[PDB]
């Protein structure tokens, strides 16, 4: 497995294009009818930073949950004692740029549990192998992963 390079995105197209995670459909709000589409991930082998102390980072689409759970397994196999960590998931708060897939519960920003920045290139490769539709080595501090809509 070869790590992604810094600022590399796979596939090599923009996130919201047809061959990556596709079109932003619209923002999902807590009060809404579309909220019921989101399902909480309480996998004990995934660390959720829970920046807002709401548990909102756990709420994600079915495909997001499926690819995140596969990545949780490959992270533990890659580095025994280390877990997948989510820094940002579903965004109720406008903390991402306009038309972010975070607003749709279709995207996670991730690290390893030990916050070893040197692991993040390989983490991104693992995210691609776990079947995330778009993977972006966005900063030294995190990998951005998203999925297609249901």
């Amino acid at each position: 497995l070869t790590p992604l390079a810094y600022k590399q995105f796979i596939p090599n197209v923009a996130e919201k294009t047809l061959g990556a995670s596709g079109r932003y459909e619209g923002k999902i709000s807590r009060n809404s009818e579309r909220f019921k589409e989101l399902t909480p991930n309480y996998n004990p082998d995934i660390i959720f930073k829970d920046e807002e102390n709401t548990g909102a980072d756990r709420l994600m689409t079915q495909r997001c949950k499926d690819k995140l759970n596969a990545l949780a397994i490959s992270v533990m196999n890659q580095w025994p004692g280390v877990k997948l960590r989510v820094t940002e998931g579903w965004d109720e708060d406008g903390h991402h740029s306009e038309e972010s897939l975070h607003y749709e519960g279709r995207a996670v920003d991730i690290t390893t549990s030990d916050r070893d920045r040197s692991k993040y290139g390989m983490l991104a490769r693992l995210a691609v192998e776990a079947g995330f539709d778009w993977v972006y080595y966005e900063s030294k501090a995190h990998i951005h992963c998203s999925v297609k809509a249901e």
Partner: antibody
Amino acid sequence: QVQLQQSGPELVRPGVSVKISCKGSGYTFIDEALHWVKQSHAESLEWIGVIRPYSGETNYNQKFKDKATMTVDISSSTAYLELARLTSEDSAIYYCARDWERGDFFDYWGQGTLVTVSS
Amino acid sequence: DIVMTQTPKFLLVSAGDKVTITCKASQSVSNDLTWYQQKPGQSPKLLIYYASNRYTGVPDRFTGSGYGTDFTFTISTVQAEDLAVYFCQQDYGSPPTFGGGTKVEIKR
């Protein structure tokens, strides 16, 4: 509401050290890196270093390696910057500033501590 | 260490007019370029990161562009309250380094 509260202004004699403080509230203090930034007339904004409370890791700008020491007290949510052997070139405003795990850039800043080095 | 050359050093502009600030890195810094606004007596305030991403609650009139060495910050339609020193900062290289700033002054 995230807040970084710095200690007051300091008058310090040349040759002497000073230790200035930065208390975080409104977030889990241990979870974010805390950076220190100098603002003088002579050199505008300069990054001094970072401490990662969660690991005790420190990274210093080589220009400050002999000057600065960063520590943290987790139980008081307070970061400290000690500046040793002061000269007039150390007179400046010192800021603490946090990142939020998106890179080494700073959403929340302390109000700044003015340090005047003088006899 | 990476050197950030910010131009111009100052600008006098009327409310409603455009401001264009340039930041040039001494080597490529990918998109790891942050813009801050420092109003007098205050700490710097984060406006733009990753060269073009507005921070939460930053108004639309502030944009940024660039990748590599050459970065542009724009205020589309400057407001009276936008008087400040603006700074760019790179964090591709360690240590992070800042530009010298651009003072924006209002003509009325």
